[PDB]
Swiss-Prot record, chain B:
Family assignment from sequence similarity: Belongs to the IAP family.
Record note on modification: S-Nitrosylation down-regulates its E3 ubiquitin-protein ligase activity. Autoubiquitinated. Ubiquitinated by TRIM32; leading to proteasomal degradation.
Biological source species: Homo sapiens
Residues in coiled coil: none
The protein, known as: E3 ubiquitin-protein ligase XIAP
Lineage: Eukaryota, Metazoa, Chordata, Craniata, Vertebrata
Tissue expression as described in the entry: Expressed in colonic crypts (at protein level). Ubiquitous, except peripheral blood leukocytes.
Effect of L77G: Loss of interaction with TAB1/MAP3K7IP1
Disease: Lymphoproliferative syndrome, X-linked, 2: A rare immunodeficiency characterized by extreme susceptibility to infection with Epstein-Barr virus (EBV). Symptoms include severe or fatal mononucleosis, acquired hypogammaglobulinemia, pancytopenia and malignant lymphoma.
Region of the whole protein represented: 22 to 100 of 497
Free-text comment on this protein's domains from its UniProt entry: The first BIR domain is involved in interaction with TAB1/MAP3K7IP1 and is important for dimerization. The second BIR domain is sufficient to inhibit CASP3 and CASP7, while the third BIR is involved in CASP9 inhibition. The interactions with DIABLO/SMAC and HTRA2/PRSS25 are mediated by the second and third BIR domains.
UniProt-reported outcome of changing V65E: Loss of dimerization. Reduces activation of NF-kappa-B
BIR repeats: 5-72
Effect upon mutating S66A: No effect on dimerization
Consequence the record notes for mutating V59D: Loss of interaction with TAB1/MAP3K7IP1. Reduced activation of MAP3K7/TAK1. Strongly reduced activation of NF-kappa-B
Swiss-Prot record, chain D:
Full protein stretch here: 18 to 370 of 504
PPM-type phosphatase domain location: 11-320
Subcellular location field: Cytoplasm, Cytosol; Endoplasmic reticulum membrane
Protein modification: These phosphorylations inhibit TAK1 activation by a feedback control mechanism. Ubiquitinated by MAP3K1 with 'Lys-63'-linked polyubiquitin; leading to activation of TAK1 and of JNK and p38 MAP kinases following EGF and TGF-beta stimulation. Ubiquitinated by ITCH with 'Lys-48'-linked polyubiquitin; leading to proteasomal degradation. Ubiquitinated by RNF114 during maternal-to-zygotic transition; leading to degradation.
Keywords, comma-separated and alphabetical: Cytoplasm, Endoplasmic reticulum, Glycoprotein, Membrane, Phosphoprotein, Ubl conjugation
Single GO cellular component term: endoplasmic reticulum membrane
Keyword match Endoplasmic reticulum: yes
Full protein name: TGF-beta-activated kinase 1 and MAP3K7-binding protein 1
Length: 326, 79, 80, 325
């Protein structure tokens, strides 16, 4: 079923999470919960995605497929208006949600499983192409960058917004729900997660009322509705699209330092672009490079050393837009 | 009428494509689309805001422009 | 707290370190009731405390002002 | 003393006013009242200007020199701050005003009186100091900066027209106690449309005796200049344009309102690759415009009823690394 034409102008790189051992170069690992999408509808419609899962990969491997069914099987393939394309996604992300919730409806090793699926979830970033017009749907902390080649440098602009507690808008939304800004922004974490929007997570979606921090709330504090970003004109553009998981920009940031991460990552993708035969290679190269920078930092510890005990799954997706590969 | 968030959202159907800030976010912030350029106005303080740039905060820009648009200060929670 | 800025001369004084390269004239901004905050090219009506930034060539102080805060009394003549 | 080093990276073109005759080969004239400035202080400081006078040239030939005295003789020459250079000009334009008023203090007599009491002028002054550009403005003369873009020629006017059509100028007059609508309606105040000007003893001290300005706690027509924050000229590559009303006024009358700044700039561009000296560049455009004017009136049609004549035209160009050839 889930086997339609794959895109050929898009590469992906990935590296499972890994933990460091005091002894040094020593590393470990854990079940990897990250997935991506790089399909192409027979009607010439492009759909890319990166889903960073948490607490089980029983969700990432679902939303991935299910999202495709509600998007590449007609519903979007057509000469739709801007607001139309938005309306379809909205309806799409919803179908995945409501459906998934219905899914999770199945020794004493039972309580073991329950606490799992009831707390399983995932965040996602979806990019859609339709006539040189780009659309970005977003739920969570994954980033999406557009990189245009300037005759005065390389322009880098993030298309989405991080749904964290540091989001002036996200906070206000939770405030209008009746919660306390200061207090929520203070803890900076809500149920092990920092994201203020996510898919699945039956626990906080239906029982938020039983959590001290979310006690007072006329509606769900953690919602799954995605933030769509008005079509982007890609006619005369010449560069590339980047979809990367939290785990990636998160590591790079821990080593080098907060901010200036988007440019640096982009800067790297630039170099490796002139040093590879395939996108996948371009991609993987950067993931490796970053994976390296992390380990080295911890090993050759000093100051920033105390910020790299390990790192989560890293996923990078690159969609070339006429940029010189050779 | 524009007190209702859903209505405010409806006024963004023809919002100029290429704009940084998300429509839905603008509405949540109490803004409504006038019709010229990327100019929006608080349904409360009737204050207008335009010239958005990437990385802008709806509520942020809003509080800066009109540091008192009640809505932004919570005097609005119909319940 | 906020008394010294009713006088136009004082408002003008707050522009001494205004970012060079800005379109609108300082004097004109002050006439419009604006005061320079200190960050970027952001200014604020001494009346409605509304702020205005991101100026562009060809802008009208009182114009943009009326648009942003369609009621900053000063702009409506409650100050003569 | 009015003879210091003159700038050599600046050209000027000018053509006296002229009136035509319904008899084709017609062409009259009147005393010319427009002046310019293109000095260069020994300390490497540049001062350019264009003063369009009205009712007598006994003022234009004054402000010109007097302004130089309070600018090129130290006062400005130095490593001053942005706001500092602004404060010096302000002080400067004031000295010229106060001084000039004291000047005008010395039957064919009533004939002269009505003259100097109504004599005046408007001015645009540009100053250079470390690739930082400053423009002081009083009146309706325009000053444009033209940067060469790799996607065309950028044209941006640095100053604002002090007319009754200026939302800001109007507001200023309103706070003084006059009526906006009424003022904006007539669009003219004492033969002039300018809301700020140098001299003009009459309206400065007796405005109270003019039906339109009757109600006013202060001078409705002031001479205070509008300074424009330093402009970064380091990586720039183009030219500065200072032109009198009479010029952009004529070109506007023939082709039509708006799109005048670009067109004039467009012209200056062409002539720039077809001349040996800037003065030539300049004059060329003035002549070209002077031509388009006469032609339109002669080969009359629709816009013909807008060119009975034209006032003095003055154009000053200051090259900024643009290819002369
Ligand atoms: Zn508001
Ligand atoms: Zn105001």
């Amino acid at each position: 079923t889930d086997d339609l034409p794959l895109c050929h102008l898009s590469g992906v790189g990935s590296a499972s999470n890994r933990s460091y051992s005091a002894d040094g170069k020593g590393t470990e690992s854990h079940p990897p919960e990250d997935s991506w999408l790089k399909f192409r509808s027979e009607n010439n419609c492009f759909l890319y995605g990166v889903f960073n899962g948490y607490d089980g990969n029983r969700v990432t491997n679902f939303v991935a497929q299910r999202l495709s069914a509600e998007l590449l099987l007609g519903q979007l393939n057509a000469e739709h208006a801007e607001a139309d394309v938005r309306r379809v996604l909205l309806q799409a992300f919803d179908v995945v949600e409501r459906s998934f919730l219905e899914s999770i409806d199945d020794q004493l090793e039972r309580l073991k499983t329950l606490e799992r699926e009831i707390s399983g979830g995932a965040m996602a970033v979806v990019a859609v192409l339709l006539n040189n017009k780009l659309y970005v749907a977003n739920v969570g902390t994954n980033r999406a960058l557009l990189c245009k080649s300037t005759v005065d440098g390389l322009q880098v602009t993030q298309l989405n917004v991080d749904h964290t507690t540091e989001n002036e808008d996200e906070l206000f939304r939770l405030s209008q729900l009746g919660l306390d800004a200061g207090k929520i922004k203070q803890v900076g974490i809500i149920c092990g997660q920092e994201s203020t929007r996510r898919i699945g997570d039956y626990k906080v979606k239906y029982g938020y009322t039983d959590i001290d921090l979310l006690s007072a709330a006329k509606s769900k504090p953690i919602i799954a509705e995605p933030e769509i970003h008005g079509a982007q004109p890609l006619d005369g553009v010449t560069g590339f699209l980047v979809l990367m998981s939290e785990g990636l920009y998160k590591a790079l940031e821990a080593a080098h330092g907060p901010g200036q991460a988007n440019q640096e990552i982009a800067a790297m993708i630039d170099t490796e672009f002139a040093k590879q035969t395939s996108l996948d290679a371009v991609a993987q190269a950067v993931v490796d490079r970053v994976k390296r920078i992390h380990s080295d930092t911890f090993a050759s510890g000093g100051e920033r050393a105390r910020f790299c005990p390990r790192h989560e799954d890293m996923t990078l997706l690159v969609r070339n837009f006429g940029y010189p590969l050779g | 009428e524009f007190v209702e968030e859903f209505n405010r959202l409806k006024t963004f159907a023809n919002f100029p494509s290429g704009s940084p800030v998300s429509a839905s976010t603008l509405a949540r912030a109490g803004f409504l689309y006038t019709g010229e350029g990327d100019t929006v106005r608080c349904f409360s303080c009737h204050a207008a805001v335009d010239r958005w740039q990437y990385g802008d905060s709806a509520v942020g820009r809003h509080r800066k422009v009109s540091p008192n648009c009640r809505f932004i200060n919570g005097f609005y929670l119909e319940n």
